[PDB]
Each structure stands twice: as structure tokens, then as C-alpha cells.
Amino acid sequence: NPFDAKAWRLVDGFDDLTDITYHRHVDDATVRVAFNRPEVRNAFRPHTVDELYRVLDHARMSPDVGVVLLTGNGPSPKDGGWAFCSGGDTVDVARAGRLHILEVQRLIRFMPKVVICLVNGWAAGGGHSLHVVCDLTLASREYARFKQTDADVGSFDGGYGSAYLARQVGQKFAREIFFLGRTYTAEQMHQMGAVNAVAEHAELETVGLQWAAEINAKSPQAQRMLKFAFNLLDDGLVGQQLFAGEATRLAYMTDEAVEGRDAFLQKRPPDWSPFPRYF
Amino acid sequence: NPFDAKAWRLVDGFDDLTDITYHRHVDDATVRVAFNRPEVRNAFRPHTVDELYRVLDHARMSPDVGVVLLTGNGPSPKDGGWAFCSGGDHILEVQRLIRFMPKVVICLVNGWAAGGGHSLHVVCDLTLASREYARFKQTDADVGSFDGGYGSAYLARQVGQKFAREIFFLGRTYTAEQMHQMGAVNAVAEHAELETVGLQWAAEINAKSPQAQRMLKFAFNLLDDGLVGQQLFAGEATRLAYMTDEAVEGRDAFLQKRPPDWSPFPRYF
Amino acid sequence: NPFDAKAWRLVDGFDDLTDITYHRHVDDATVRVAFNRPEVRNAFRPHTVDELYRVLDHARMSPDVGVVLLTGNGPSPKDGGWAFCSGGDHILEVQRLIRFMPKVVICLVNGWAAGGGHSLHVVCDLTLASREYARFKQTDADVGSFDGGYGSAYLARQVGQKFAREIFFLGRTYTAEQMHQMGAVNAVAEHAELETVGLQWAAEINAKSPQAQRMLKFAFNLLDDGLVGQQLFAGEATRLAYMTDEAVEGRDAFLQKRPPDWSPFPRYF
Amino acid sequence: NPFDAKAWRLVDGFDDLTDITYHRHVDDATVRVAFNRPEVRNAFRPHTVDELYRVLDHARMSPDVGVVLLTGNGPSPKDGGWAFCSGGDHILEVQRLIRFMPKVVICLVNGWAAGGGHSLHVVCDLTLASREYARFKQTDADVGSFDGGYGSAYLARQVGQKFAREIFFLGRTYTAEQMHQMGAVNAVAEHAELETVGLQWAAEINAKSPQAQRMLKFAFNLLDDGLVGQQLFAGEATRLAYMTDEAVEGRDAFLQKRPPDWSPFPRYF
Amino acid sequence: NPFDAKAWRLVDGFDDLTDITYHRHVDDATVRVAFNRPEVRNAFRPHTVDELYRVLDHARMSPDVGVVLLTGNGPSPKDGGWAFCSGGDHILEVQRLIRFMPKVVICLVNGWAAGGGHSLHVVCDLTLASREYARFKQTDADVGSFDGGYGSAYLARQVGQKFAREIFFLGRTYTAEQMHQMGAVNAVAEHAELETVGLQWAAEINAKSPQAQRMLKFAFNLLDDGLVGQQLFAGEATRLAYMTDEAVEGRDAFLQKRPPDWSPFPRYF
Amino acid sequence: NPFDAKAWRLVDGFDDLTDITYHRHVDDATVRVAFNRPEVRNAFRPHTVDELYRVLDHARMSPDVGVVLLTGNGPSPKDGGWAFCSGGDHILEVQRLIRFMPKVVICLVNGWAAGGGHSLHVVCDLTLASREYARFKQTDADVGSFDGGYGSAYLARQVGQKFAREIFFLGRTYTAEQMHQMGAVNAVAEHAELETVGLQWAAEINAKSPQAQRMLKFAFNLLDDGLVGQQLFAGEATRLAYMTDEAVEGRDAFLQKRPPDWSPFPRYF
């Protein structure tokens, strides 16, 4: 099993979770968020999505977490098979039909932390789309299976799952993945450019933690700017908003800005003299 | 006073609000969300942002609400002045909430709209402004701050690049009529009638197909917001497909385990 | 020879074709569109482009066709050589017809794909290539020409900016396997099996929801094609909307001269 | 009446048009394409769109025509009303034809421009409007429809995002002067002089270098149209390159079976 | 005459300028760069462009200069006419220099702004125009040239796509006030007061945080300028981060060959 | 040692160079520009960047130079090891000069390419790498730095978003062959043959039409670089136009004080 209990501690306040598990590493600034319905191939129901959203939002707001590992628990009790995520499982009509998984994609995209998907088995439909939006993907050599099946049922992910996949594997390969909906292995998707590295199944989370540790070893501020720099143009004004918001925060810390805030409350004319027009 | 108390009821469940008020119209599919710190020119402190986010997010999830009027309460009990929102005393999360919600948000600028408050007006779908009292000022750079996101770059998609750069670089105060001429204010209203007019705009939006309005909003956001724009618009497109006979057939043929039959459905061109 | 005559039937109405052949599969929603000048390495002349347009335009409007296989006939009777298309002896219009048609176009590169013929493979949705015989060469710059549109800039969205630049600046010849490594060729097939593989690909495409397939192609085009990409994708959203109960009510309330009742139709979020 | 019968001749080969008229100016490089269903406020049925496409495509390919005036015939014989085009009774193909044609297309809005007809005016390069009778109205969402393409997103590139949102979300009627203030109408003309003014603007356009006007149109389309926009502009650049002595040297050498001498042609910067 | 000799001193090191003048205000962090060929309507020859480049580059690299005033000297000694710049008697390099310099460049259009002269005004951050004498004309296409770059596409980001296309396609002469209405001119000033107003605008820009103004300009440029816009904005961000405690530590560790300690620096969200 | 002394001559007028070397090839239109501080792993100090900018700008202005080979001298005289460029001990200006120059720049990564040195390789048009000694490592975030421009966002347009994020966030060291597989290195060469191979690629580039190569490089930049990319590409197209009969006519007419006759020049479609 990829899961090594000795590396993980439950996060306080999440005793009520049924469809997701959430652990913090014993030492490292890393959390493990996982689908916890292996008996149904880790398909998500609206309750799952609510919990996933809650847990990732909590991880986003934890100042002592730099890396989220997103994965699926397993294996299945009914068949021994392995799944990361196999996709989706008048007032209330509206609130039922929530596009909640889309809100979860944006939370992954926008959070100032590196999210690594660890693909431990089937990554199908909305599950495949979740792997696509994560910053990095590591995959199980033996059991990772990628398959974009949406169009078999007349559905499609016309957003991050398709258009952003073309910015990883190129337009020819991403069209093939969607138009034919074939099943690919970890090594096939690594060769195309959507999986970063392939790991032995039992060592997938071990590799995920080495990756997280190398990320957490660098300047957190730099890692934040880099993720938003990578999102920026592809995300248009939203991209610029997140990236400029981090630049605004940086500026606030400077002597110049401290001068400027001084002046306003003190009530005098700000003094820009000390601060050159850099070029 | 633009506020007509008789028109509005408090939304249940928000008795602990201190910095924001939140009403639903007595008859219309319209809510009124307002800054409630008039003695401090409606500046937001972190608690105000928490509350604003909570109220708008509830508004977003209210299936019977079509339009959000976002405004400030007044006048100031200190100097009798008028403020929509004077900026900072999390606000990016609220900007994205306004931008992504599948409902039209109209800012009713009833007074000063400065700094962060000016940026909030810019990211709203529509803006109506008090002729007498709306004042637009982007002051950020006085204290060495800047909104380098929707407050500036998106403003330039309203008034064009020369006017947007003037607004930020000089930090002058602008009237409702000035901003209407430049293209950032949709209309000017008599101060006392600002909310009456807002309600009339809301009623006109609410009279059209809600499906179509939601699609148009995301269509206007789409390219400017890149893949996020695409994600929201395509998301609604996925919803529309879900409803079709084709997707029904697709879902049925999956469970009654069999090959789907697409022969009844053209390859439209 | 990749061509299996038993799988194909001539399309009615095209007896006069001289430079292109056009067949429909005996069973599948697939057509075969081929350069028919192997004596001249399948170079296109003006009349060739005209015919290729009419044929692809017909394929676009055929509601029982989901996939186009685009290839070159062969071998050359002069020298036994193999060519998909070697470029010009109007082609921009044919690129846009491939790009915008609501069906998956697969290029089967059975031989040289050079200059213009290289750019046609690039703009196709997918490419399969003959292991033994496909030869990819962008020679535009030798003769002072350039495809500064889809053949270059879109190629960079398949193989990345370093490779696409190499391909054009140096004009070297690449095998199917090389172009597969780089990302411009989806798969390599044995020469004799290229069309058999293309048909298996086409069958897998046509076994899915045609609606979802059309939506996905326009989703992949969207942002890269700017307002044109949004026009095609949103044009399909409009079509989906028209089918809904909401629009039906919208439309009837207009005809019956009453105010629309949107009340049964929730404000989705 | 804006139409001056003496100024125009029927274009040859269109004796079978019923829903559109197509004239060429007596002296100028200018055509007049007009909706011809005034009894029905110039709404388009599928046959109208077929004809409109055929006509505009013929004008695109007419090398002696520089400018298309696109307008609406009237008045209505039923009530005396004036209509440019009131929208739907393929139109996306017409929009790309106007967008992509290497000629300036001026919309002369002589009356109502509603729904799809409003979107046609938006996609034209320039719009002149009848002071007295132009009415701009974007009604789509009333019937649960929407133009999520050029008619909305591209309108926002003319009047800015706040006004474009306003126009669609409320569906109010606007006068020529209002749209001229907002930046969607270039100029307002006396009703009776609309075509006269149109022809004067056409003549000023036709007096300049046609190759330059072509490049400038494609320059204005380019970045908004993503890869399509790049394809059309680069396509014109390719054409310019083909004319150069450098290009000649490369073409000569190819057929002359020798290696080219780039010696004469310097390395610009 | 808008030039006030008493306000300006020559910049040291520039005695050899013949085609441009370059002054620094006696008191303010503002420079005056101006075309100095009034006898030929301030048309630029290659030597003019060399000098213009050298001067603006100097201004860019002058840390005590916050704002550049770019204008035209006059009147003409021949006819008493007034010209900002009438264009081409390398300019793309100057355009980029204006565009990328981390300082506000205000164009003061005191006279004719035609051809490349019009395009320079368009690329400046802000434009102030002489009420009586500013004339804006885009003439390129008369002689078969075009600015398909900032002069045309970026103008559409100020005035909208309809007005920008009119401006180029007809090549009419516009007044200061017409350009102001359309959105390409920020403000109109009495001719004699043009440089006084420009100094006042400069002083209001120079009164705010220079770092905020730098960032804002690159935020305005960013998405329009793609990866270049990103490069400039992110480069400023990189400069900010270098100053922080966190970066100081990172730097310490490397040089001291020890492992950095990030614990003091929180994961901001 | 990749450097073949017999192949290269010093360029006149750069005798004062300390941190960079500059050679022109004895026969070919290719220059060699190289970091010359192998004792400090070719790290650049500000003086190095000044010299690099100056040399590259000279090459950009040399009309008899088509290709720039950008590399690092060595080995280190202290430890026998090899570096292309280890980054910092102005560099954004150098990245832009490489990006915007109308010549192909090939980085020859003959050793460590780290930090700013890695980002220089990334912005080059092509990269060839030493099998045995090339080591690519993006170390920025180790000391709290980042290239948020071309070094990161443009790397993603070569190797794709997953790979670029890995390269930055983990900062691992990669080989030539690993980077070739990812898409950022065009080809791998035996170490002592790196420049021999670089010269062969240069010769293949220099044997095509220099005008086509220039337009190609700007086509590849265009959309990614927004309005800057359009400015550059449109700039070339304006040059092409200046050459035509139509533009010669427009010029003559204006000189001869007569109307232009555009009569002989068709409206191409």
C-alpha cells in the first residue's frame, strides 16, 4: 500500500469526514488529501465534493503547509482494484445541480501552495480533470490508468480538463486523449508530458514526500510567486490578479510603503527622496 | 436618503452582521448588500471583508435571487458625508466572487468610492452613480499601494488605456458624470432615486431568461479571464448538454449496460 | 498500399473530380479525402485547392459524417515514391475549413508532407503517420516563403516553441517517429496499415456523443482562436440553449404575446 | 428615403435574389447589400442568410470592389416603419465572412437593429446610423437566446465592458446618438443622407492604397482573433513577400535546380 | 507659445543635439523632450530618431526624473503653423522605449500629430492636447504604408475598435476635443497653457510613491504585451522580493554554505 | 574543448572586453558570443551584462550576420569543469534583445546552465547541449529569487506546464538528454563537437531566405508577445509593403503633388 501510517497525523477538526481523509505530515509542511470511497472507485458524490472543498480550503489557509498531496485511498474492498478518482458518481433543483467540482479546480489552481496529484489507480472523467489541474502529477507505474471518458455519456469538461491539458501535452495529444478516450498508463502519460514522474506503486507517497520536501526546502515566497507566474497569462485577468496581489503584498513590506503609510496617518506630505526611480 | 426601508427585509440568518447589511427586496428577486461603517466613510477592516464574502456567497447560492445591488449605507453621523466604500481601513477573494457569480451585480455608488472601494465598483457588472455625491478616486499610490489586477487592468477594458492610466497615475477625484462619459459608470441618478433606479435595472434584468443572462455574463468574462473565463462558460455549456436527449441517451445506455445509440441525433454544423 | 478499396464508396455528385478523391466508408460515419496527383508528389495547384475546398465543405455539411481522413493517394507511377502532399505546385481558406468544422479531421501522412502539405497536417486535429514513408519537411524558407499562421505558430502549440522553431529555421526532414517524439504526430503505423489504423481511430471517435465531440473540438480551439474560437464554441452553447424548456417558454410567451414565466427555471450556480 | 436609385446598378448574375438586394455603384468601387424584407422588419429566415452569404462572398471576390455598404431596405409597406435588420425570423458564417473579408464593410443602420441584426452591425468594420430612425436593441435574452460571440464580446471591445453588459443585460432601446456616445456608432447622419454619407466614407476609404487598407484591417483583427487573426495578417505578409526580388531568387533557383544567392539581400533590423 | 524658457534648463551632455531638444525642469523631477525641426512640421529623419532614442534612454536611466513630457517645438519659422510631429520625413525601438520605461511619458500634442507622429502620441501613457492647434491625422495608407502595431491596435485599446478603424481607414483630421471624446486624449488645454498643464499633471504623478507608479504602469501594460508585459511586471516583483528579510536569508545561506531557515517567514495566502 | 580557434576571428572594436568574448566566423555569417569567466562558472556580474548587451546589440546591427551562437568558455582553470552560465554573482534587457533581434540565437549549453543562465538558454530560439557536461538547474527559489517572465512562463511553452513547474519548484539538475526529452533542448551533441554542430545548424539557417527567417522568428514570437509581438511582425510587413509597386506609386503621387492611381493594383483576396 502506498500509505505509510507512520508518516501521517489526523488534522484536528475533521473527525466528521466520511468521503475524504486529511492528514498532516509528522515533520514536513505537507498534507495528504485523499478520496476515501475505494468501494466505489473513489467516485465523487456532492457530499464528497463538499468535504474535498472544505479540506483543501483549510489546507490553503494553513500557514504551516506548503504542499498538498492529492490522492485516492485503496485498494477496493470489493475487488482489490485501485482508484485515484473515477469522476462524478425548483430551489433544491438549483442547489442540487451545483458545479461544485469546478469550484474545487479553482481552489487548486489559485491556492498559493503546490498541489501534487499522486495517481494511485484509475484517474477517469472528472478524476482525470482533477489530475490535469494540479501543479504536478506523480503516478503509479503498475496501477495508474488515465482515461477521459466524458464523451461516452454525452458530457465534456470544456475547461481545465481539456484546454489546460493541451498546455501540458500539446494540442495533438490532448485532442487524442479526449476524442478517443483511450486508457493510458503512467509511462504513456509521462512520455506525452502530463505526468511528471512514474513511481513504483508502493513507493508513490514516499516519492511524493521527497518531492514535497524539495519544494518546502525553498523560499516559500518565491514558490508562491512562481506558481502565480506560471498561471498568469493562461488565466488572463484572474492570473494577473493573483500575481499582482502577491506583488502588492511585497510592496507593502518596503521602506517606501512604510513611509507612505506613515505620512497618511501622521498627516504630512510623504517623503520619496530616500527612494530612487529604479530601472 | 436612497434607502427605502419599506422595500427591504433582512435576510434570515445574519443577526450577527455588524459591518455590512443584507436585505432581500419585499417582492423582487434582488438583494441589497451594503457597507455599514458610515462613520468611517465605509472603509473595510478585515472583519468587514469576512462579512461581505459571507453575504455575497450566500447571495450567489440563493436560487430565487437574480441580481445583487452592492452599495454603502449613510450618511455619516459625524459630518453628514456620503460614502460607498473608501477602501482599506481577502478583498481579492471578494472581487473574484463578484466576477464569477452567475448573477448580475450592480454597484450603486452613493458617495466616495476610493482605493479598494473604487476597485470593487470596477469589477461589478454594472455601476449606477449618485449624480450629487458619487466621487471616484483611486488613491492607492499616495500610500505606496496599488491594485495591479481588476482595479486597474479591467478598468482599462471600460474606459480604454489612456483614461485608466490617468485615473491611477494622478489620483484625481471624478464625478459620476465624468465617469459616465469615460465609460466606467453606466448611468447617473438623482441621489434620492439611486436605489429606485437600481431596483428598476434589476427588474429589467430579472424579466429576461436567467439561463441566458448567466451565459452572457460568462461570455463577457470569457476571453479576458483566459482559462478561468473558459472554465465558467464551458461549465454552463456542460450543464446545458446534460439536459439534452442526447446526454439522457448517453447516460441511460451506460447503466442498462449497452452501446449508446446516437443515430437519432444529427451532426449539426 | 494503404488504400483498401473494399472499405470505400464514391460520394454522389463528384464524378468530375480530377485532383482529389472523395469516398465515404461502407459502414462508418467517416469519409476519405485524398490528394490525387501522385505523379507530381501530390503538389496542389489552384484547381486542386478549389476541389479540396468543395469536398471538405461537403463533408462539413454532411450530417451523417463524424470524421474526415485526409491523406494522399499513391504511389507515384513515375517513380514509386510516396507523398501525402508536397505543397503548392485559397489554401488558407481550406485551413480554416479544417479548423472550424465541427468534426474531427485526421491527417494520414502516407509520404512526403512538405511546405503547404506540412501545414495542412499541422492544422488537422490528429495525425497518424507511415513508419516507413512519412517524411516531414518544412521547406518554405528555401524559396523565400513562410506559413506565418497555423503551420508555424500552431505547430508550436503541439511540439513546443523550441522544436517548432527548429523545424522551420533548418527545414530538415523528419520521420514519423521523430515527429511523434516531438508531439506533432499522434501515432506511427505500418505503411500498409495506416488507413486501417485511421479507420479504427475514426470508429472510436464516432462511437461517442457527437454533441460532446463537437463541443470538445471548439473547447480545444477556443482561446488559441480568440474571438473566433469563442464565436464557434458559444455558437454551440446557443444551440444547446435553444433546445431547453426555458428557451421553449421564452419563445412561446413571445409568440402568444404574454410575459415569460421563468418561475419553473432555477438560477443555477 | 436613403436610397438613390440613380446611383446604383444591379450586379449581374443575381436575378434570382428575393430576400436581399445587391447593387454596384455607377462610378465607385462600392457595393450596396441590403435586407429586402421590409414587410417583416427585415428579419432573416434561413433563405435570407443563404443569399446574404452568396452576395457578400461574391463581393469579397470582386477585385474592383473596395467597400461593402450593408443596410436594410424600407420603409415597411405595412406601417411605414424603418428597419435595418430585426434578427432571426449559418448567420455565424456570415459574421466570419464580414470579419475576414479583405475589404471594409460599413453597416448603415437605417432603422431597427435588433437581436441578430444588432450583432451584424457590431461585427462590421464601421457603422453609420440614421439620427431619426436607427434603433439599437439587443433582445436575445427575452426569448432565452444569446449571441456569446462577436455580438457581445466584440461589442465590449468597442464601448467597453460596462456599456456592453448594460446593452445585453437590460435589452433597452438605444438611439444612434447614444451608441455614437458609447463608441459602437462611428457617426450619425440625417436619415435621407445616410447612404450619401456612406458613399462619401466609402470614397475616402477607396482613395487610399488598397493593399494598406487590407493590412490595416487584418492588423486591427489580429490579436482579438488569436491564431485566425494571425493567419489572415501573416497570409497577407506572405503575399507581400512573394512579390520581392528575394522571393524571386528563391523561386528561380528551385526550378533552375541550383543553390540560391542571398548575397544581394541584406539582413534588415 | 507653450514653452516657458525660465522653467527649463538644458541637460548636461547634450550640446550636439540638432533635431531634438532636451531640458530638465528647474525644480521638478520632470524632463522636456521635443522635436526640433519646426520648419519641416517636426518630421523625423533617421538622425532625428537616433537623437530621440538617445535622449529618452538617458531619461529612462535618470533616477531623479519621474515623468517625461514629449512634445514638438514651434511655431514653424516658415508659415507660423504648429506641429507636434508629422511623422517620417528605428522608430519601433523608440516606441518600445516609451512603452517599457518605468516612468510616465505624457505626450503634449501642440500641433499636427500625423503618421508616425500620431503613433507616438498613441503609445505614450497619457496625452494632453492643444485645444486650438492639436490636429490628429493618420495618413500612412495614402502613400501605401501602415503602422500595424501600437499605432493601430493599441489605439483600439483606447478608443474602441469602431473609432480606431475609422481613424485609420478614412484618414480624417481630428481636433483635440474629438480625440478626447473618443478616449485617446486625456485632456484638452488652452494652447499657451499646454506645458503648464503638463507640468501640473507631472507634479501630481511625482507626488505619489514612485514604486507604486512603476508597478502600475507595468500592470497596465501586462496582458496586452503578453510575455513581454509579464517579463516587466514580474521583474519589478523580483526586485521587491530581493529587499525582503526572507530573500536576505536565502542569500545569507547560499554564501555561508549553510541550509536556509524559512521558519520566520509565513505562508501568506 | 568545443572551441576551434582556427574557425573564429575577433570582431574589431571590442579589444576592451573582459567578461565576454566575441568572434566572427572566418567564412560563415555566424558570430560566437561567450561568457568568459570560467573560473567562476561563468556567473555574470553587472559589468558582464553590460558587455553581453553591447556585443549582442552589435551583432543585431551587423547585416552580414545571420546567426548568433551564445555559449560559455572553459574549462575552469581551477577544477577542469564546464559552465555555460551559472547565473548572477540589466539581464531582462538582454533577454529582450535576444527575443526581438531579427536573427536566430542558438544557445550552446556546454556545461552548467543555472539560475539566470538557465533563463538565458530558455529565451534563445534554439538550444543545443553537451551530452557529457550540460547540466540544467533552476536554482532561483533556493535564495528567494525567481524569473517570473521568460525563464518560467516561456519555458512552459516549450516543455509544457507540468514539466516547467517541476523544473522550477524542485530545482533538480537535468542532463541534456533529459531536457531534450522534455522539449527545451533541440539536440544533444558530443561535448568536443558542440560548436561544430552549432556551426552546421547555423549554416543550414543561413542558407535560406533571410527575409523568410526574420518573418518566421517574428511569427513564432507574435501571439505570445501580445502587442510587442504584433509590433515586430507588422514592422516587417510594413517593410515588405514599402518595397511594392503599389507603395512606389503612393510615394510618387505624394511627391509629384497628384492623386495616386491604384488602378493597376488588384484587390487580392
From Swiss-Prot, chains B, C, D, E, F:
BP GO annotations: menaquinone biosynthetic process; protein hexamerization
InterPro entries found in the cross-reference section: ClpP/crotonase-like_dom_sf, DHNA-CoA_synthase_MenB, Enoyl-CoA_hydra/iso, Enoyl-CoA_hydra_C
Keywords for this protein: Lyase, Menaquinone biosynthesis
Record's signal peptide: none
Residues bound to substrate: 41, 78, 86-89, 112-116, 139, 145, 242, 257
Origin: domain of life: Bacteria
Pathway in which this enzyme or protein is active: Quinol/quinone metabolism; 1,4-dihydroxy-2-naphthoate biosynthesis; 1,4-dihydroxy-2-naphthoate from chorismate: step 6/7; Quinol/quinone metabolism; menaquinone biosynthesis
Molecular function, one GO term: 1,4-dihydroxy-2-naphthoyl-CoA synthase activity
Catalytic activity of the protein: 2-succinylbenzoyl-CoA + H(+) = 1,4-dihydroxy-2-naphthoyl-CoA + H2O
EC number(s) stated in the UniProt entry for this protein: 4.1.3.36
Gene Ontology CC entries for this record: plasma membrane
Feature type site, description Important for catalysis: D140, Y242
Stored HAMAP family: MenB
NCBIfam families assigned: menB, PRK08321.1
Function: Converts o-succinylbenzoyl-CoA (OSB-CoA) to 1,4-dihydroxy-2-naphthoyl-CoA (DHNA-CoA).
Family: Belongs to the enoyl-CoA hydratase/isomerase family. MenB subfamily.
Quaternary organization: Homohexamer. Dimer of a homotrimer.
Protein name: 1,4-dihydroxy-2-naphthoyl-CoA synthase
Originating organism: Mycobacterium tuberculosis (strain ATCC 25618 / H37Rv)
Lineage: Bacteria, Bacillati, Actinomycetota, Actinomycetes, Mycobacteriales
